[PDB]
Point group: D2
Chain length 337, copies 4
């Protein structure tokens, strides 16, 4: 029968997930919601015609014996608390980024999870479920190119609003590269360095954009990540892995080609939300399927959330200092292997 899901936080992202589970995916139902604004949570229940109980807070929601699993989609700084509560209630949890606002916060979650003795926590890094990244991973695991030596990647966005700050380039943007790369090559980060090219005319005065982030893994892989969030031409994710004997590269999103007015061309997406639409569906379906069939979650773990937190911290530190900063990671427990 259905995985009974409770949703913590019914803003934009919560609603997207509620719609996804209710109208797109298989094997789950939203049976409980809670939001800080009780009125909005009730509106979401009518909007999506749910047979769902509205709770005033996450504690009461998690005490519902008929809730099997929860989605944490609230205000970012509020995530860690709900994730901890869900773990103590021994219920599966899918948490949108971030897992916690600090490495210490991530560690707290890690510790409680290791206690429980099974995987409850899945973090919403959806790139691992994208078909392009799955293909790169399969090629690497089959040794198509030999040992990875270097990674060249770019995260580009047409324009950002006035609220977007320099730190957000790593904390909100490069965080996705940070999660997916160590997964692809199975190696931990060791150091980071940030280099600023001349500033783009497309960037607001307070914002350092573009940026280059150079990351070295413990095994000696060197990653050059370009971040340019005011590139104007489109939203563009590029990733090239250079191995000893060959090179693999992420594909462009599928597009018909056009020959017109002296150009041969394909489309470039303009909206970041459209780049990984398929991956959001697959990641939640995997959450549901893995729980139903295996009794624990797969996909990005609480430890992956910890790695992201420590690495983003080091990047923001390197943004400020201009020197090479250490990424200091605890040893990966056997629990997460």
């Amino acid at each position: 029968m259905s995985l009974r899901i409770g949703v913590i936080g019914t803003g934009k992202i919560g609603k997207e997930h509620i719609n996804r589970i209710t109208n797109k995916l298989s094997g789950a139902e939203i049976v409980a919601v809670t939001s800080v604004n009780q009125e909005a949570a009730q509106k979401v229940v009518e909007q999506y015609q749910l047979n769902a109980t509205v709770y005033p807070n996450d504690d009461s929601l998690l005490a519902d014996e008929n809730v099997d699993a929860v989605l944490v989609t609230s205000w970012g700084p509020a995530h860690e608390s709900s994730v901890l509560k869900a773990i103590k209630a021994q219920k599966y949890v899918f948490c949108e980024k971030p897992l916690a606002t600090t490495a210490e916060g991530c560690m707290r979650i890690v510790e409680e999870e290791i206690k429980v003795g099974k995987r409850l926590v899945q973090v919403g890094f959806m790139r691992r479920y994208d078909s392009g990244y799955v293909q790169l991973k399969e090629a690497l695991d089959n040794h198509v190119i030999g040992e990875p030596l270097m990674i060249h990647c770019a995260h580009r966005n047409p324009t950002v609003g006035d609220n977007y700050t320099t730190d957000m380039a790593v904390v909100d943007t490069l965080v996705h590269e940070i999660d997916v790369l160590h997964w692809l090559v199975n190696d931990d980060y060791e150091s980071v360095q940030v280099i600023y090219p001349k500033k783009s005319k497309n960037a607001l005065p307070h914002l350092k954009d573009p940026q280059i982030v150079v990351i070295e893994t413990k095994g000696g892989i060197v990653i050059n990540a370009e971040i340019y969030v005011n590139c104007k031409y489109g939203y563009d994710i590029q990733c090239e892995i250079v191995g000893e004997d060959g090179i693999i590269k992420l594909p462009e999103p599928s597009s018909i080609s056009l020959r017109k007015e002296g150009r041969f061309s394909t489309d470039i997406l303009m909206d970041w939300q459209r780049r990984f639409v398929a991956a959001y569906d697959v990641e939640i379906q995997d959450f549901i399927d893995s729980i139903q069939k295996k009794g624990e979650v797969s996909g990005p773990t609480a430890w992956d959330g910890y790695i992201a937190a420590v690495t983003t911290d080091a990047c923001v530190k390197a943004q400020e200092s201009g020197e090479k900063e250490k990424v200091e990671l605890k040893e990966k427990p056997e629990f997460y292997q």
Copy 2:
């Protein structure tokens, strides 16, 4: 609540659909099955853990007041009969190719449907739901290239078994091109001609392969379709539309690129079943969603099935005669516009 679906025919294709609806898609449930082999239908119910009643035939299944819609996935020549029965029972029907074995059979269905006064019948031509074809259609509807003048397409397959005959190149293979093209350019076929290049070493002696089929629409669009089912290199669908002012082309299925041993390359699929995996999901979801929200089906119609039957007939006739054969189509009723 759920669209309650009955499945007529529980062979490979039926089971794929039962799995799709039960484990992948949203808003429907299999509540009834029937197969010629009663024992196999019961096995399918256990296999997929369905809360479903097993019926000895389609009449009794269609008389189940709690069946809202049916899938017809039985032996091809058996389709027409079930489709007719479902229409008379005023229940929605998704029918796998073919709709009927003859144009006359398709017309019978058309006539009964026009009576009912609403769209009950959806035919399983899944290409219309493929994202590449959706993009081509959107470009055409927005007049990106002006009037379509010519279409160059290819349907290639690595190898076929000894059962595959010359007629099957049009009846089983080109039928997909036949459905999607008139849809893309909104024009009816008028004539066809078949040309045989020298025979491939990869083809069995009884089989004429490759083949070229030249189709002219009533508006004067000329289509050159290459069929080569023993091409050895892969399964490959290519489609290029040449308009007055530009040219649009279907993309390759997404693949990472590789630089290795003196070649820069991407993958070509080997299995025809994998080419349109996404489209099968989307087509059935559309069947469900369109019924639930609109009270009738969208997607390929009984008339589209009729167009396919008449056109394939003319192609097989041209295969035999070697001359240009007329495609004689009745006028498209307002019902299907």
Copy 3:
């Protein structure tokens, strides 16, 4: 020492060749010119600072003991006469298209050449010297794709002037495809059929454009050639050869790529003169080098000119008749093998 070259016809094409030999290529010098307009020939001698004698006609030029070889670049219908005279004077001749205005004219030249006992005549079909076509030829000769079965090609041009007529699509345009294809696959044409799609808005009322020409070779290769001289988007040569075990395709002319304003694109040439600029240089250098080192010419022969004349004739006949027309070719002499 230098190949001493005389030029017959000092219009645009002659001047291009005179410049090429004088200022670009190695091992030849223009030592004689003749034109119908004596005044223009003298102007060309000053313009290019030649140490060259001006003759009133081709007879006197060919009687110059210090002329080793000639270029025939006069008015098309005037070519055959000069080519014949040069052969009788046993001097090497490079002839711009056409070799003669009729198949009979080509045969006259063929007969006289076979007498001489060595290759004097090279015809200006420059595609054979284009690096893309050289690569296709090398792949075929090395059996990369097995037996050629089908060829899909296109010859597209942005727009043509009011003087361009329906026959010119084959006589002036497809003539290049006609020469290069039988060379690539080493097979003779057997029949042709012309099909007219709906007429482009970009074409003048007197002109049938676009056109499709279907050609079958004696070995059973089927060629679908699209001609569209008012395609507006660019000048575009496309050629795809489908073999038993694989497919090879001519590359796009080299262009940097651009990501800008939501498109990823490369350039398409607009001018037909630029498509094969390199090939003109290579073809004349080969004329010079082959003579100097081998004492006879290589490259397209008088027989290749004959094949073109017979085939273009059959195409124009098929343009008019609408039926499949025979290409009736004499047996290729051992001389041209």
Copy 4:
């Protein structure tokens, strides 16, 4: 009449140039040669059938009143001396890399040239004449992408012999990137940093390979250059320039495409000598044409040679130190603007 050329150094590179001028290009003749091995110089004169005087040294060659210009193609450390002598003899000089073994050596040449008051010296950096780089330059000059902010490039080679050392990655290899990039974006280098990924299994123990070189220009452009001379898959030059509003990228060398055995592919060159074959021809023709028409040389200057020497020095220093090193360049004289 012909540019009369003397060649200093008749080894492999000299002979290639002698062949090029004698048998490929227009408007020049080799009229003098000198080599350390007098016997080999005489052999080269017979080999290429030159009407050329053999001199025992460069002084006597440069004193030949009938030598207009010289090629310096001797042992690298011997270049500077001949270049200086040629300048004092006020004769045009094409010098193969390097112009001199030190920045000081380059400056000596610069000083003497500024005296003469006109451009005599052209340095053999052939990339500037490659059609791909010409296109990138044209796009930049026309502001297609706005201000350049970042450059991502790679110089890859299949394998190197045991003589190839770590310093040679910058001195023999990246020197080409070093010359072409400041030319493309019209900005001077300011600092460099070298980063070593884990060592490739394909590299000999004494060799650090691959390498990443990060270069910042004075205007704030950041260049990430990957050097990998044991990449095994091919010889590969990649160059992507990221501007404020768009991105331009160097094309792949032209290749037919192949669909075969489940892959769609194009060729990658294996030999570094073939990558820029066209550019060598064009660069020498430009040397000849520019002298004949303009009375001075164009193309890469003695100052460009100086920039290369200073930058390569800083790179080798950064290879050793592991820190960011300053590129200290004198002010570009008006003479070279």
